[PDB]
């Protein structure tokens, strides 16, 4: 004698986006980070 319909809701999905690109890490691998307090880098020469 009793009736109930339902309640709705439940399933949802999400999207994800990507990171920067190919050529930013191509340029991120070619730079400097700094001198921590005081160091040197390079002073050399070769083949006479």
């Amino acid at each position: 004698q009793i009736f109930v319909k339902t309640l709705t809701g439940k399933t949802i999905t999400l999207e994800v986006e990507s990171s920067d690109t190919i050529d930013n890490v191509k340029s991120k691998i070619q730079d400097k980070e700094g001198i921590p307090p005081d160091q040197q880098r390079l002073i050399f020469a070769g083949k006479q």
């Binding site: 009793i2 009736f3 319909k5 339902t6 709705t8 999400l14 999207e15 986006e17």
Partner: protein, 508 residues
Amino acid sequence: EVGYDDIGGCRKQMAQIREMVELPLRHPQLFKAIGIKPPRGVLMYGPPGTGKTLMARAVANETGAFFFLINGPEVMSKMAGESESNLRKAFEEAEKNAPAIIFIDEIDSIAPKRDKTNGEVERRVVSQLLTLMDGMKARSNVVVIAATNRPNSIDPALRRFGRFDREVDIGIPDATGRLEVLRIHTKNMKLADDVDLEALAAETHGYVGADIASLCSEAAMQQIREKMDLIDLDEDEIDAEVLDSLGVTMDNFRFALGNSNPSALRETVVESVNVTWDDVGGLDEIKEELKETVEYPVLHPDQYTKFGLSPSKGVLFYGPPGTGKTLLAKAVATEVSANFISVKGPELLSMWYGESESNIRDIFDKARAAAPTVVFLDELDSIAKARGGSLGDAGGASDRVVNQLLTEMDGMNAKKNVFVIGATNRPDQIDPAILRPGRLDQLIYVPLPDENARLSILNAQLRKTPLEPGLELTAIAKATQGFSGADLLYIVQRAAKYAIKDSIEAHR
């Protein structure tokens, strides 16, 4: 190019859209010294292809400016924040070549409501368009155009003061507007000297404009298919005397008028059962009373406007079962010029919470989009249930789905000549608020047929029969006293079943 002449009808709404795209561009000194320029945004809503995607194509060729277009979800890509930037550089592209005109299409994916999205990038694109529309305030700017259906699903922050406050409705042409559609769409075609363009618009009453183009396409193909003489398949050129044009006749438009199928009721197509106003014989004063109350507001809509009175709509059928009253609704399926919508009782009832009241709200909107039409509600006892004494026996709010039908029959707006027909066998279990002249005017009662009525009942069913040498049918009428209309169908079916049995026994 499409120009000014391609838009069919819509003259009361063309004059609104002309003054906001032409007069700031043609006369820029007119808006000076009278204050600032009011119109900078517009939104066209309604059915989607009634002349909203053509209006953007119209202003691209009759208003010379640096025009470009914005589609739907084409601004989305697999980057970080580029989705809010490429539409920013699209607006900046329109302003670096100022003066220009900008059109964005289908803002359902671009600008949805902020409460429906949940933590994704789509809630920032609607916020990006909200900032750049009103923050960009230079001199002689661009005017945005939105041509999108479903206007109630738009966030109300996009209508505050400056995003768009000049939204317009491209209305459905009901009378003498679809004639201006047919004058333009058949101008490029070379019609034969048989069609009547006023008769094609006066027979039907509810179209959408785009289906009028669907009417001429199927009428053009049926004339080619009738004149399809395929003898030379490799040479594939149909001349038969000379390089000529076949055209289209009046009979080809009558064939396309049969399978019209408008877009408002494409999901609510009825089974085309043939009727010719002669399947019912016993009803001679209630059938013509049914035809005059459904034709007079739709065939001659001038006398009701002259008197100033409301038209009559809404009729209920009640009586004993087996004598018409649902198969009379079969007679108005293909015969009347209004479209038919059939409901087989609780077929539109759903098991979800808000879906059962939403499946009854939109069929009436499909009856509202289709200009004047008739709907049919068979077995209203399954819908009404007298609105009294639930006490848990209703359970799933069976009296609350009735209250949705309370407000749709009388209507909060002006009535568009829709016709509701209810058919049932018991008038006592119907709620008495259904029986009021605001919704159902008269309650006609079909009686049991007498001897004069049931004689022409047997003449109605014996129409297409390979009859024997004839016998009198008045003797069968005086013997079958007090029977319904379906009871006499059983007698002619039993007599026909004996006519099949002896024919097989005669063979071998």
